[PDB]
Every structure is written in C-alpha cells, then in structure tokens.
Amino acid sequence: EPLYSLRPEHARERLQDDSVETVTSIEQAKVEEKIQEVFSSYKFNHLVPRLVLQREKHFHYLKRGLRQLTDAYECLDASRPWLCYWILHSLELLDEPIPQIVATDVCQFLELCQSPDGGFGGGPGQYPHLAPTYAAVNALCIIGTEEAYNVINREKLLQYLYSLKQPDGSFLMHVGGEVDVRSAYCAASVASLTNIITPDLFEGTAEWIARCQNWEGGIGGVPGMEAHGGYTFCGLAALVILKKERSLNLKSLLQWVTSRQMRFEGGFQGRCNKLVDGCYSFWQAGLLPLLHRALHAQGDPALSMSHWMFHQQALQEYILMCCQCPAGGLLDKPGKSRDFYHTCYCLSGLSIAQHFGSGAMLHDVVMGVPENVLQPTHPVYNIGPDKVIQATTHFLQKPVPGFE
Amino acid sequence: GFLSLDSPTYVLYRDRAEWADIDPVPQNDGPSPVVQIIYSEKFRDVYDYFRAVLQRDERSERAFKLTRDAIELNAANYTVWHFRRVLLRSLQKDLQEEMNYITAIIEEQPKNYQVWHHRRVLVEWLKDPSQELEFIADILNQDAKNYHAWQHRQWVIQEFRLWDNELQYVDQLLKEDVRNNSVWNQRHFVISNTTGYSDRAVLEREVQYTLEMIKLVPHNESAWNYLKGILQDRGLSRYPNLLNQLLDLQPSHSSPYLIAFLVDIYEDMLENQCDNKEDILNKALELCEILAKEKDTIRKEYWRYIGRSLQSKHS
Numbered sequence A: 001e002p003l004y005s006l007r008p009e010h011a012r013e014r015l016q017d018d019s020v021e022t023v024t025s026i027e028q029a030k031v032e033e034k035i036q037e038v039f040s041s042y043k044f045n046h047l048v049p050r051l052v053l054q055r056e057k058h059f060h061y062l063k064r065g066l067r068q069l070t071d072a073y074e075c076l077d078a079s080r081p082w083l084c085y086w087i088l089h090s091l092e093l094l095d096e097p098i099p100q101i102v103a104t105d106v107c108q109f110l111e112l113c114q115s116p117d118g119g120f121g122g123g124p125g126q127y128p129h130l131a132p133t134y135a136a137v138n139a140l141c142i143i144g145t146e147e148a149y150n151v152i153n154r155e156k157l158l159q160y161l162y163s164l165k166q167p168d169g170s171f172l173m174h175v176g177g178e179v180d181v182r183s184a185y186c187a188a189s190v191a192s193l194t195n196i197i198t199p200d201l202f203e204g205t206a207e208w209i210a211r212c213q214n215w216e217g218g219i220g221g222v223p224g225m226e227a228h229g230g231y232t233f234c235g236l237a238a239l240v241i242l243k244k245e246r247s248l249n250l251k252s253l254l255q256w257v258t259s260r261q262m263r264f265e266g267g268f269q270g271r272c273n274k275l276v277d278g279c280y281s282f283w284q285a286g287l288l289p290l291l292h293r294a295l296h297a298q299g300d301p302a303l304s305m306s307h308w309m310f311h312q313q314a315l316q317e318y319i320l321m322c323c324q325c326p327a328g329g330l331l332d333k334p335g336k337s338r339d340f341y342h343t344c345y346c347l348s349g350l351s352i353a354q355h356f357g358s359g360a361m362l363h364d365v366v367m368g369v370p371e372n373v374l375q376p377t378h379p380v381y382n383i384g385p386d387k388v389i390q391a392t393t394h395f396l397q398k399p400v401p402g403f404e
Numbered sequence B: 001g002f003l004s005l006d007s008p009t010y011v012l013y014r015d016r017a018e019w020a021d022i023d024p025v026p027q028n029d030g031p032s033p034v035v036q037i038i039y040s041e042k043f044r045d046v047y048d049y050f051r052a053v054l055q056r057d058e059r060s061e062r063a064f065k066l067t068r069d070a071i072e073l074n075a076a077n078y079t080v081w082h083f084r085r086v087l088l089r090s091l092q093k094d095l096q097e098e099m100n101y102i103t104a105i106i107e108e109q110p111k112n113y114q115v116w117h118h119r120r121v122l123v124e125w126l127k128d129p130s131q132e133l134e135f136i137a138d139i140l141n142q143d144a145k146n147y148h149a150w151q152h153r154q155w156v157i158q159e160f161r162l163w164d165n166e167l168q169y170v171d172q173l174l175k176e177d178v179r180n181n182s183v184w185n186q187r188h189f190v191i192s193n194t195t196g197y198s199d200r201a202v203l204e205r206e207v208q209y210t211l212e213m214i215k216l217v218p219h220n221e222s223a224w225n226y227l228k229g230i231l232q233d234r235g236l237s238r239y240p241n242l243l244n245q246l247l248d249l250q251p252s253h254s255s256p257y258l259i260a261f262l263v264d265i266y267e268d269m270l271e272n273q274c275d276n277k278e279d280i281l282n283k284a285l286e287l288c289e290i291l292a293k294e295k296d297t298i299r300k301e302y303w304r305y306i307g308r309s310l311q312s313k314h315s
C-alpha cells in the first residue's frame, strides 16, 4: 500500500480507448502493458518492493564515461561539452566528489572547445554553437574553481551572443543557423551566470518567447508549433532569468504541464498524446518550481507550503522502478538503452521530486530507502543551487564587458 | 570516383591515390583526455582528412565528397554542414542533386536537426517549394508526429503562402488518428492564419466538429484541449450554452476531461460576476474534490490549488 503505483485502485488509471483504436492508443497500451509488468514484478516474485537508487552502479557508469567512451558514442562527437555537463551534473546529484586532477582536465578540454571569437563548440576546433556553450558554462560552474571560471572569455562570449541576436528578439543557435526557444534560454543562462548582460542584449527576447506559447498553454520551439516540454522549460526558465514571467499566461501553462503527468505510468510525456519518457521528469516537472516561484512573486495566497503541483511520489516511483538500468545509468522507459542524457535528466527530475522549497518552507519526499535522497538542483540552470550562487557571486565581482 | 560510406568496396582516405598529397590533421584532445570517444578507424580517418581540408580551406570537389562521408558518420556535426554549404556555392553544385541527397538522408535520420535546416536553406536558395508538401507528407506517413517535419511544413506554408490545401490534409490525418495532437496543432495553425477564429461561422463549425470528435472518442485529450484553447481567448463564461451541452454528454460520455472542463467554465463564470455565485462556487469546489480524491488523483495538488484559489478569490 505505501506505493501509489501498486495500489489496487491504480488499475482504474489504464487507458480507456473508447473501443476506437488508432496508432496513438495502440502504442500507449503497449507501454502501459510493459509498465504494469514492471509494477507487478514484486507481487509476482513474492518480494517486498524495495525502491533503491543504484548509486554505485550509476557512479561506476559515470566515472568511466567521464574519461572514455566506445565508438557507439561517435554520434556525440559534436556534443562533448554536453557529455561533460550530463556526467558532472549526474555525479554532483549523486554527491560523488570530482577529484582536483579530473576537474583540471575538464577545464583544459573545455578551453580547447572554446572559439577565439566567443562561445564553445561541440569539440576541439569545432565552430561555436549556443547548445555546447550552455553545456560548457554549466560544466565549468559545477567544477566552480577559479581555474574553471577563468576558462570563459567573457568579452568574446558577449560579442558572440550579439552576433546571434536578431532584431525580433530571438537568437540564432549558431552563425548561419536557425532560431528556436532553446537559443534564448542558452543565451540567458550563460549571460546571467557570467554577468555579461548589457541593457539591450535581451531587447524583445521575452516578447519573442511569449509568441511561442500556443492554444495548449505550453510553448513550441518557434511560433505556431505544438507545445513541447523541453521548449516549454527553456521558455519559462529564460523568462525567469529575465524577470519577465508575466509575459506568459501562467495559468494556461500550469494547466498544460500538470496535464503532462501520466495517470498510469507516473512519469511525464513531452507532448499531449505522446509516450512517457524519463528525461521529461526534468523538462516537465522542473516547470512546477519555476511556476511556484513566479506565482509566489505575484503574491498568490493559494500555493502549497509543502509540495510542488505534480504527484512527486508517482514520479519518483516511475524513475526508481522503470528508468534504472541494472548495469548503471538511467533511461527513457523499460526496454530502452541507457545513455548519459537520460542519466542526467532522470536524476535531475528525481531531485526536483524529492525537494520542495519556497520562502522559509522546506519539505522533502524521499520514496524508497532514505539513501535515495539526491543533492538539490536549481530549477533554472539545472546545476546545484550552491554552484549557481558561487558562480554568480564570482562574476558579479567583474564589470559587465564593454565592446571592442 | 564516388564511394558510398556503407558500400562494401569503401577504402579509407589514407589509402586513396587522389588524397596522397594532403597530410591528415589529428584531433587534439589534450594530454589527459576527458569524454574521449574511441573512434573506429573509418570515423577517425574521415575526420582527420576533414580537419586537413577545413584548415587549408580547400574549396574543391574532393572536399565536397568528403563532407558527405563526415555527415553520414555524424549528421549532428554542424561544422561539417557549414563547410558543405560553403562548397555548394563556391563550386556551383547542382542544388536539385543536393535536394535528392538531403531527401535520402532525412528519410534515414528524420529526427536530426541539421538535415532539416540544410533542406530549408536549399529551398530558400532555389526559391522552389514545389516538392516540399509531398516530401513532408511521406515523412509524416512513417512518423505522423515528427516535430521537425511539422516545423518544416509550417515554415514552407508560411514562407511560400501554400495555405489552400492544408485544412484538407489536416482532415485526412485526423481521420487516420484523431488523437494526433500534432495535427490538432496544425488545424489551429491553418485556421488562425487564414480565416481566423473571430469569424462566427468558422468558430461554430470548429466547436461543432470538435464536440462530434469528443462524442466519438470521449477520453481523447487532444480534442478537449482544442475545444478549450479556441474558446479560452474570449473566456469560457462568454459561451453560456457550453455548460449545459457538456452536462448533457456527462451521463454517457463522461471523463476526467469533461469534469475538468466544467471547473474551467465555473472558474471563468466566477471571475465575470455570474448569477447564483454561491451555487457556482459550491459546484466548482465539489468537482475539485472529486478530481483530487478519485477521478484525477495524479493531479491532486493542482486540483487542491484550484480549490484553494476559488475560495481565496471569493473571500
């Protein structure tokens, strides 16, 4: 009875297809049958459900990956600062120390990824791009040493962000690239952490992000597009950095994200009528601490003083029972292969689900053994709150750069 | 001559006579590597020769063919894609042959971002969208919810004003899968950019169409969200018949979506000085309790927040 997903009344949450089968309901029923097999395994094997986060297996997988990867990772040869970030953030969440020599080696590698005209590329000598720029700055802030902060060329990073800024408020992902909401979040994230925000760098950006909120309440990658969890996280997190959350309809956004939690699986889907996926444990659930903060700022008196506005227990049960690989690492759903991307965002979502905080109120929900408790993560940057304060404090001692 | 990356007679660039003059440039990962990928011989060979042509900026036919192999090894390498577009213009390459190439690689890797951006650049360069709606319909025939394919479809339709047949295409895909949210989004995208929803006959047609889809598949959330989305702009309380018509469908086509929509109607009624305020508030709070405790327990914190919000706004 302690587990919400195993209660007999939970069987009522299975899909009701109204006797009208389409590709969407057939695929949803397939996932629910597989997820029910996982939930029933304890009753079938005659064991007490013992939800354990396999920290040791996760740590071994991560420490090896931080050094070396097989040719199976050739598809991430233009995403190596992302691998630094996903692995260091997973280790930070697991409270696993980063040795000083390993930290120096990461700094030296990200220096090779930095472009002479600002920003970082997906690997040594690659052209800069806002996504590896975001990942590299987050990785360097997780390290948080004077050496790590000194890697960033702030003067050139500012020049680079301006070269991507468009008159409509949006940002290109890279020179000769395209625009989407992620670019605005990448730019707002690195610019606020390094204290390089000039008065007009984000002119029109909040209004451009608001044009991406659609009829569903969520946000699409560009205006006109379907609401999607990853882009909605990017949109709202960028507006929180800019202090412009009121540009969105926060009530239609709140109703949309809460609707993305799956009644049966407990995890989150990325879009309406799509499948559950472990990485949306961060992208979707991470929106509720952002909305709580945004609504608290407006003086909302109806907010909870102990829980986020999602079923924290059901999300932890989905991550712990369905998203762990027995050999270490986490995954989208049972039957999928592990990867560092899902390891990072399943653990980030698990940490959001465990820790509520607002004003002077703090309340934890740790499903399973007490050792499952993770270190907290900041919902805007998705690095430890201590690392955000340490980096912001460090760069606030430097002036905002001038122009060449 | 040409050699496909996956052909059985593919040879490494270090064994090709027409490449003997250039020295490969190895990747510098530092003396203490991190996140180091142990590349296969084939991958390492292509990229050592790619780094060589990129460093000297060789704008040649052999460099152009080399970018095809580098892309096929890692289609997310945006630096290789940038150099391929520099070579397409410098060498005056036939862009219809490049359209045939991008068609084939998108068919292979339809979820890669770079391939779709490259296709958009070719369409912009040629100023020719004549193959796009048919090509995108082929990708959507394999995965009807591919986010990049829908984004490219919206870009082609807006940029080239190809609005005339999209509502018919939307109707076709809703018949195939009425739960496809990407198609309900495309429906909103077409109507909002052509007639708009301020036209009464269009809004009435859309709400009547959506209510029929709800009657046929009551637990399909997309139709409920579309009904809500097109009426929430003016406010749900501005449509007084909506409440009684949903209460009529409740005893045989009920769901947590119908009950939630009733709370949304009552919330807007309370904000707009409705008749029988105490009765409307009591009905709204009773439904919040039913949703939190039985019909939609996964959203218990949301429904408890809504219930507390209604009490706060009334007091």
Ligand SMILES: Cc1nn(C)c(C)c1C(=O)N1CCN(Cc2nc3ccccc3n2CC(C)(C)C)CC1
Pocket (backbone or CB within 6 Å): A075, A076, A078, A079, A082, A131, A134, A182, A185, A186, A229, A230, A231, A234, A283, A341, B076
């Ligand atoms: C994994 C993987 N496998 N392959 C083959 C590749 C190339 C990768 C990779 O490098 N990725 C995955 C896609 N994301 C897209 C993306 N950029 C973002 C920037 C900031 C914040 C979020 C961002 N998101 C995620 C979404 C918002 C789309 C959910 C970049 C990192």
Ligand code: DMA
Pocket (backbone or CB within 6 Å): A230, A269, A270, A271, A274, A275, A277, B111, B145, B146, B147, B148
């Ligand atoms: C561009 C983008 C992020 C698309 C979503 O990817 P997906 O269709 O593989 O995932 P989901 O089905 O969860 O949206």
Ligand SMILES: [Mg+2]
Pocket (backbone or CB within 6 Å): A174, A177, A178, B078, B114, B117
């Ligand atoms: Mg690109």
Ligand SMILES: [Zn+2]
Pocket (backbone or CB within 6 Å): A277, A278, A279, A280, A332, A342
């Ligand atoms: Zn995922």
